[PDB]
């Protein structure tokens, strides 16, 4: 199928508390597998998936160093951007980075990204073409010029196509299990009483896995896209996820209303009523 290896990086300066906090978190397809954190007593790349304890010393050594290397590089970047935006050494600031690749059935690179944000907003990003940047502001325009002279995009294209794709292929062989696995949503509707001869019908999806799911309500074949409340998918904590979606309906008329469950581990979509 389609597959991704994505890295989420954070750097938070914290004046009067010493050096910034640094974090590299890695994901294969929504599955966290590695984490490195600069506050930990043992600041080192660590597994976070059974199938990662798979890897030998020489590899965890390697990454920890690269990450120590990356940490120092952002420490300067927090300072560089202070410089760019004319900001004092008094405020906490955040650098965020999304980094990685996606490959298709044939294991060929579909999309590659290097995405930066400062203080919770787009700073600079590598365009799909993997040759050009879009810059959010006059500040980012400096990095753009800089990285244009240094050939950053040339360098990053090579990584995303060569190295990323290759590391991704490994990790998937490292754990086929737990990763390809699917838990279907167990669904039901719940009746809840309300003022003014009305009912709230709540459609539940529980213990499913991968997070992605769709719950819709319909009245007589038609989706009630307004009218309908809907919490954000939440982790159960056990590896699975939960979600509900509800609607309001007059006592007696419950049966005119169907709930629908769409989840990539379901044969046909599910259909339910009270």
């Amino acid at each position: 199928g389609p597959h991704s290896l994505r890295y989420f990086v954070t750097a938070v300066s914290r004046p009067g508390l010493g050096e910034p906090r640094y974090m590299e978190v890695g994901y294969v397809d929504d599955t966290e597998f590695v984490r490195f954190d600069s506050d930990a007593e043992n600041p080192r790349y660590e597994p976070r998936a059974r199938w990662m304890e798979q890897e030998g010393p020489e590899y965890w050594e390697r990454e920890t160093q690269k990450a120590k290397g990356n940490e120092q590089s952002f420490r300067v970047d927090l300072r560089t951007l202070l410089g760019y935006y004319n900001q004092s050494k008094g405020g906490s600031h955040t650098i965020q980075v999304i980094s990685g690749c996606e490959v298709g059935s044939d294991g060929r690179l579909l999309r590659g990204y290097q995405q930066y944000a400062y203080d919770g907003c787009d700073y600079i990003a590598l365009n799909e073409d993997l040759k050009t940047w879009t810059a959010a502001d006059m500040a980012a325009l400096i990095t753009k010029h800089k990285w244009e002279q240094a050939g950053e995009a040339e360098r990053l294209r090579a990584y995303l196509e060569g190295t990323c794709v290759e590391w991704l292929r490994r990790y998937l062989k490292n754990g086929n299990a737990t990763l390809l696995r699917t838990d279907s949503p167990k669904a039901h509707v719940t009746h809840h009483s309300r003022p003014e001869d009305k009912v709230t019908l709540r459609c539940w999806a529980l213990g499913f896995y991968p997070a992605d799911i769709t719950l819709t309500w319909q009245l007589n074949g038609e989706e009630l896209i307004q009218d309908m409340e809907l919490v954000e998918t939440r982790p159960a904590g056990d590896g699975t996820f939960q979600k509900w979606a509800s609607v309001v309906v007059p006592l007696g008329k419950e049966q005119y209303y169907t709930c629908h469950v769409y989840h990539q581990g379901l044969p046909e979509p599910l259909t339910l009523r009270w």
Binding site: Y7, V9, E24, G26, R62, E63, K66, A67, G69, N70, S73, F74, V76, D77, T80, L81, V97, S99, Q114, Y116, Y123, I124, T143, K146, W147, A150, E152, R155, L156, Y159, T163, C164, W167
Partner: peptide, 8 residues
């Protein structure tokens, strides 16, 4: 394996 970052 994460890339290594070029300074801004």
């Amino acid at each position: 394996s994460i890339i290594n970052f070029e300074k801004l």
